[PDB]
Fold this protein.
Amino acid sequence: HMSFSHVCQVGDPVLRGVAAPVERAQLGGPELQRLTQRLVQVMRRRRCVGLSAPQLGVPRQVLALELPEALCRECPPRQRALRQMEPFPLRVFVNPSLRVLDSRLVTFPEGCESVAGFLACVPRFQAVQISGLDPNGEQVVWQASGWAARIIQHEMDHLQGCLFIDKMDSRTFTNVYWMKVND
Amino acid sequence: HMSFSHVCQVGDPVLRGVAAPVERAQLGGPELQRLTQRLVQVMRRRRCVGLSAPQLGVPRQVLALELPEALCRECPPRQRALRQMEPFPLRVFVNPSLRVLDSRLVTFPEGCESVAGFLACVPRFQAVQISGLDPNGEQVVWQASGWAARIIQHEMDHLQGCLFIDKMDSRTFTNVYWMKVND
Amino acid sequence: HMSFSHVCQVGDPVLRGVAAPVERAQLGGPELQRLTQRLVQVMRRRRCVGLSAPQLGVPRQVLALELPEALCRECPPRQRALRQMEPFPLRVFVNPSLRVLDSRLVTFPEGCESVAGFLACVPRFQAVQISGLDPNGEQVVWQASGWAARIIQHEMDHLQGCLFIDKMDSRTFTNVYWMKVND
Amino acid sequence: HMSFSHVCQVGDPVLRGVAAPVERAQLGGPELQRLTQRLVQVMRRRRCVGLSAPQLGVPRQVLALELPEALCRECPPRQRALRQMEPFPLRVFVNPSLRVLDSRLVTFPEGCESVAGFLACVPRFQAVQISGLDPNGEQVVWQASGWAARIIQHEMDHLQGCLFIDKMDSRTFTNVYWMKVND
Ligand SMILES: CCCCC[C@H](CC(=O)NO)C(=O)N[C@H](C(=O)N1CCC[C@H]1CO)C(C)C
Ligand SMILES: CCCCC[C@H](CC(=O)NO)C(=O)N[C@H](C(=O)N1CCC[C@H]1CO)C(C)C
Ligand SMILES: CCCCC[C@H](CC(=O)NO)C(=O)N[C@H](C(=O)N1CCC[C@H]1CO)C(C)C
Ligand SMILES: CCCCC[C@H](CC(=O)NO)C(=O)N[C@H](C(=O)N1CCC[C@H]1CO)C(C)C
Ligand SMILES: [Co+2]
Ligand SMILES: [Co+2]
Ligand SMILES: [Co+2]
Ligand SMILES: [Co+2]
């Protein structure tokens, strides 16, 4: 008995609210386990590298992040090196907080599963750390730079009701079927 | 005798360039007449109230504006009065320039045929003057306020390579299939 | 007060289910009244001529139809005549059934708010009868031809889990930003 | 130096035409080289596994196909095995013809870069041979089964003016942001 899930699209107010914290008594519980399993499953089906609970319609501070080596390798080596893209294992964070460690800004195109079909360049900090709980309830601080830091920031912004269209260079917004190419 | 026309979508660089003037050699000529006729035809087919030549792929300073009574009438009356939405006849402007007459800002939702399917709230000046040539080279000046002034501003921005997403309140950006309703 | 509503998009399984009937006990009731008020409000905000409860996420046999004169005059006279498009007052039907009175097929482009942004040609019967209850349980039978018969058939198909892409000439499917025009 | 390329979307009549053959005089030439390099670049940028000239607005019988290992490994092993998905190198075909080698039908979801953002299940033959010329005019033949045969048939359809929506199971058409998941 399979089921349907959908990623909410811009216009749904759940993407602009401030997600609520998960309560201690829910940690390690069945309901949070179903939510984390669904987030990871959607994230992986869509081949995206992060997803947050509000995008599945659940206004709670939960997000998952993963970048498999196959996806880094899909990126041409020069572009991979420019973006400082390196793989990293799946991590799920509950009630996370972000601390900026290197505030230099780096700008590259990104897109969001909740604004399907578009990209724009967005400046992001070079390095950050995210601290929060696992769904079992243990604390972890994960520090990263480059593309991983960009993913952490994009996903953290979703828990504050922020989407990348709020931070983009709007003259670079584009449907994914238009692209710049080498002559 | 039928052909296809298309409204360019965001990503096409024609929408971000600064449109070149129409050379005087072209005024009153067949090529300019085919372009103005096509802009008016597509504007009326799409039931929209302004269109510019870069949106049909032509990087030239030409735009058309029209608000038929039936479109105003489709607006509920209290919204129509708040927006100061009143009908006006077709005008076509070639090499137009804009001056602000009343710089008070008014915010309402707008959409654009070149960012199909979305709306966002955009501040606009209350009143403006657009001056330019009709397709035959005669001077035309139109001072407008309220919703007519907002239409003029949106079309004139297209000839500078500016889309409403560059000026919007991005937290109000929405797919048109999401909307606020009265309970 | 203010709330959000959305029209479900294709992929949502609610659009492919067969809506359940409203039980006799519910006719004239406050829950049905909430649904019918919401359906008509969304229909009027989107300026669409018909809407069904599955498109608001509610798998119940309830639809609304309305074609105001202004909306109707937005179509040029020659096209309204070809399409037999005439205004008609609001009807809300509960548990409707359809009978075909004239099975001649008529084909014109149609779109659906649950497949936002596309049109395609769809053959429809020239005249039908819809019979059902008004939200109060009164029996209402409406015989319609031409464009109103097409709206009726499109909304009734929603209650059976059928969308217009199931019945279209697929070689005429188009984004709305492409159109055939007269030279 | 850089320019912009776009994948034409449904509605553009170039996608429904039957593409003209490449004339013998053009084989090996610079214009055909520019077209093939552009196809391969867009195909690689978009991480898709085939692309045809009509989709870059050029109504000529040219297509390219490529499934790199990394892109292949984005798909989980169980799903790869089910779909008979394996990597294969770049091939570019000019004036190709298709012969069916195993007419057994296999049904899975596919999407098209010219119908951005949707998928639907389409039955396809289990094995085919494509034969045609390379850009230098040498005979190229490739016998393929499973997922590779699907991609061949999808690209060949584009040179006949056929899109997947003409062959799909329409009840399975879905926005990519709706998906079936495991409980
Ligand atoms: C990069 C920062 C955003 C990471 C997370 C998003 C997915 C998402 O919206 N999470 O909320 C994603 O994977 N986006 C991808 C993305 O932005 N990419 C994928 C490769 C490169 C970059 C576009 O430049 C695709 C799915 C649009
Ligand atoms: C109002 C300022 C924009 C006027 C021009 C646009 C058409 C366009 O993009 N021209 O470039 C339009 O008619 N847009 C309409 C529009 O913005 N409307 C219709 C009335 C209300 C407002 C949406 O709030 C619809 C078609 C999206
Ligand atoms: C004609 C049969 C479909 C009518 C009802 C639909 C809206 C809807 O999906 N109902 O479920 C509608 O108004 N569609 C309009 C529609 O198809 N129109 C407007 C009149 C002309 C035709 C576009 O050719 C627009 C919103 C797409
Ligand atoms: C499989 C048959 C179509 C192959 C070629 C297309 C791209 C295209 O339109 N070529 O004309 C594609 O790669 N489509 C992908 C595709 O259909 N996929 C990618 C992974 C599996 C399958 C989705 O079920 C995405 C990009 C939609
Ligand atoms: Co996102
Ligand atoms: Co516009
Ligand atoms: Co519909
Ligand atoms: Co395709």
In short: Chain A has four helices and eight strands.
